[PDB]
Design a protein around this ligand. Structure first.
Ligand SMILES: O=c1ccn([C@@H]2O[C@H](COP(=O)(O)OP(=O)(O)OP(=O)(O)O)[C@@H](O)[C@H]2O)c(=O)[nH]1
Lengths: 123, 161, 300, 146
């Protein structure tokens, strides 16, 4: 039941995000309501979180592939839908495996950003 | 390429009486009470108007001499020829009195004294009084004292009637 | 077919571009009717402000002798789609450019447009969120910043839009001379027969104390700014409603041009496919050859 | 169409259209009595105080449960949703008939009052990590249960 419910929620959110995209295109992101932008921000993470590096496309991508278990996928998407990872940066979901890889990439993103800030600070 | 001045679109100018002219006996004062570019009263005939300027209170009747008054936070009274009274409260501004029989009272804020609440006015004074005791610096104390003066004027204005 | 559906997708986007724009028309027809209250309650606050500052002077002598900085404060809208208001204001400002010109534009579009175009004259701009009503405090913020930009300024000029009617939005200018030049003119209007209409007004100010005069000058200057921004907002909403009509018609013309190409394409597609099939049918008929007829021809 | 952007204002036509557009979701066919009764309740405004998310749960309780009997408050003599043979009586006699109109309104009013008092009140008070999930699962199950 959890698998079925999660999948339907993902599909509905993606469908709604596409409709909101027209409004973002015409009116702009500013004019969207509080609820709409939360859908936008969550949906974009879903779009990037669906991507996955395959073990056979290492030459094309240049990164090691991942094998995500069925349970890990369901739990990761379930938490994302209800906003458990709203504070995680968007790009942390791009070309990764399970939720654990997302957190590691976010940590790496934070570290490099801190280094850039330190370099700017010295300047 | 010459541009119009913004006053050309305004069709209600001020009429000044030439000094070398005969006098007229006037029984009505044309009042224009204005707030934030909005007239609450417009060329409205009133018997008298009472205004509180920095020096003191002025009772303006028709034919009053040309004068400019810098108002202070205080009540303003408008009495019609019916003898009926309408009382507002102003926070500041200016009053221009013309010898032709007109009075244009432009205020930053002009609210009917009914709208103001005495219970709210009293508690607010108490809060600012505590801040004045703990007010960090001289400037902060001066600002707080400005609020208290307005509040006490409001409280005193409502207690009068 | 993809080609046919390419037009259908294109028209699908056009068909909803209209809905989003139509909702915007409704949004901007609420705020136009909400701000229509000013139409009733205007044209009376600025009566003695006219006497203070109304001086129909020449447009050359007032800018040729720019001994000190001239601080222009054009009024511009935060959001685009307003129309030609901002463009005209820029033309009005470009026409006054001087060595002694300092710009303190209002609105995000004003800042962005005037920052790029005149980059050594722009100083900084004021931005107001269109959340509350245009009040005195905002005007006082405009004036205070204007003075700090150039305290030793020959004149502070506000260039805004006057809403004459629903379809007429002209450009208006409030010019505020600094204290020194104003009190000098106020002194001449009092003593001399020149400026008769201001004689009584000027003498009624000279009688009072100076601080009162300075407060009077600042107060009426704020009112002029308040009127300009208030009018510029009403012109903005009125203009947007008109512009958001022009977009509707442009998006309707496209819908009538992409529909024809869609209906012209389906007709051609049906004809060509049918022609292909018949060509193959004729080819297979032509290649076919009838054999000798094995019938009793003699017994006829 | 005008609502999408501009902060839709919830007039009574909108307050009832949303419920109608959320009673239309279903997986299995609905018995005539259950469907007609639910539509009538939403038509007369009995669901105006019910949030759109809980409409399916409200319908499920109305059909497969009886709040009045649960709390010992039902006063109707024959009109109960567990009497599946009322369908043909409703077909012969419209809901807007004195034979059935009086009891129908009484049951709907009682069911609506009990639901708001007991269930929706608890739903709006859910603050936890597991209760929220349980509520979400319950709503989804009711969505495809009636
Ligand atoms: O030492 C002085 C002398 C005069 N003044 C100011 O000069 C002005 C002269 O004002 P007027 O001479 O024109 O009239 P007035 O005495 O009736 O004035 P009010 O009290 O009715 O307002 C008044 O506003 C007075 O306060 C001072 O402030 N200080």
């Amino acid at each position: 039941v959890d698998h079925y419910n999660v999948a339907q929620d993902v599909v509905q959110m993606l469908t709604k995000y596409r409709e909101l995209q027209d409004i973002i295109a015409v009116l702009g992101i500013d004019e969207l309501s509080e609820e709409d932008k939360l859908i936008v921000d969550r949906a974009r993470k879903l779009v990037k979180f669906l991507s996955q590096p395959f073990q056979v496309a290492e030459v094309f991508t240049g990164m090691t592939g991942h094998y995500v278990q069925l349970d890990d996928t369901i739990d990761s998407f379930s938490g994302l839908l209800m906003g458990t990872y709203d504070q995680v940066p968007e790009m942390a979901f791009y070309m990764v495996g399970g939720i654990n890889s997302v957190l590691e990439k976010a940590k790496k993103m934070a570290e490099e950003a801190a280094e850039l800030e330190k370099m700017r600070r010295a300047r | 390429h010459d541009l119009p001045e913004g006053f050309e679109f305004m069709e209600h100018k001020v009429v000044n009486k030439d000094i070398h002219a005969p006098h007229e006996n006037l029984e009505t004062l044309r009042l224009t009470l204005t707030r934030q570019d909005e007239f609450l009263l417009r060329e409205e005939p009133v018997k008298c108007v009472t205004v509180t300027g920095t020096n003191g209170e002025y009772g303006i009747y028709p034919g009053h001499a040309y004068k400019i008054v810098q108002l202070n936070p205080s009540p303003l009274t408008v009495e019609y020829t019916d003898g009926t009274t309408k009382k507002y409260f102003v926070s500041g501004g200016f009053a221009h009195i013309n010898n032709e029989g007109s009075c244009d009272v432009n205020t930053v804020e002009c609210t009917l004294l009914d709208d103001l609440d005495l219970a709210i006015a009293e508690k607010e004074l108490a809060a600012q009084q505590a801040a004045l005791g703990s007010a960090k610096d001289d400037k902060a104390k001066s600002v707080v004292e400005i609020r208290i003066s307005v509040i006490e004027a409001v409280i005193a204005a409502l207690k009068h009637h | 077919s993809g080609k046919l559906r390419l037009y259908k997708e294109k028209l699908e986007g056009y068909n909803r571009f209209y809905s989003i724009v139509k909702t915007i028309k409704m949004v901007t027809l609420a705020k136009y009717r909400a701000a229509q209250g000013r139409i009733r309650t205007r044209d009376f606050s600025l009566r003695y402000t006219e006497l203070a500052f109304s001086k129909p002077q020449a447009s050359r002598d007032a800018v040729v002798a720019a001994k000190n900085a001239l601080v222009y404060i054009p009024i511009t809208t935060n959001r685009g789609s307003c129309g030609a208001l901002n463009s005209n204001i820029v033309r009005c400002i470009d026409s006054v450019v001087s060595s002694k010109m300092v710009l303190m534009p209002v609105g995000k579009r004003g800042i962005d447009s005037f920052s790029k175009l005149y980059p050594d004259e722009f100083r900084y701009g004021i931005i107001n969120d269109m959340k509350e009503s245009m009040h005195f405090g905002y005007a006082t913020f405009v004036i205070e910043n204007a003075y700090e930009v150039s305290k030793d300024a020959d004149r502070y000029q506000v260039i805004f839009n006057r809403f004459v009617s629903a379809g007429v939005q002209r450009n208006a200018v409030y010019n505020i001379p600094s204290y020194e030049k104003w009190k000098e003119d106020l002194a001449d209007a009092a003593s001399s027969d020149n400026q008769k209409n201001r004689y009584l007004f000027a003498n009624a100010l000279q009688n009072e104390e100076e601080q009162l005069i300075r407060d009077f000058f600042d107060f009426h200057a704020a009112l002029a700014v308040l009127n300009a921004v208030g009018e510029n907002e009403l012109s903005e909403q009125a203009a947007r409603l008109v512009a958001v009509e022009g977009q509707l018609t442009n998006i309707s013309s496209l819908q009538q041009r992409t529909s024809s190409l869609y209906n012209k394409t389906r007709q051609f597609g049906i004809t060509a496919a049918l022609i292909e099939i018949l060509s193959a049918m004729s080819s297979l008929e032509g290649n076919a050859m009838k054999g000798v007829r094995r019938n009793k021809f003699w017994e006829g | 169409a005008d609502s999408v952007g501009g902060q839709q204002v919830q007039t009574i036509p909108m307050i009832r259209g949303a419920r109608f557009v959320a009673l239309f979701n279903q997986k299995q066919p609905s018995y005539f009595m259950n469907a007609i009764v639910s539509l009538y309740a939403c038509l007369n405004g009995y669901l105006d105080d019910v949030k759109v998310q809980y409409v399916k749960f409200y319908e499920y309780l109305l059909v497969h449960r009886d709040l009045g009997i649960m709390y010992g408050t039902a006063k109707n003599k024959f009109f109960y949703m567990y009497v599946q043979e009322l369908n043909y009586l409703i077909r012969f006699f419209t809901l807007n008939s004195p034979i059935l109109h009086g009891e129908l309104e009484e049951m709907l009013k009682q069911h609506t009052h009990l639901f708001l008092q007991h269930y929706q009140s608890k739903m709006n008070a859910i603050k936890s990590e597991k209760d929220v999930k349980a509520l979400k699962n319950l709503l989804y199950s009711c969505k495809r249960a009636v």
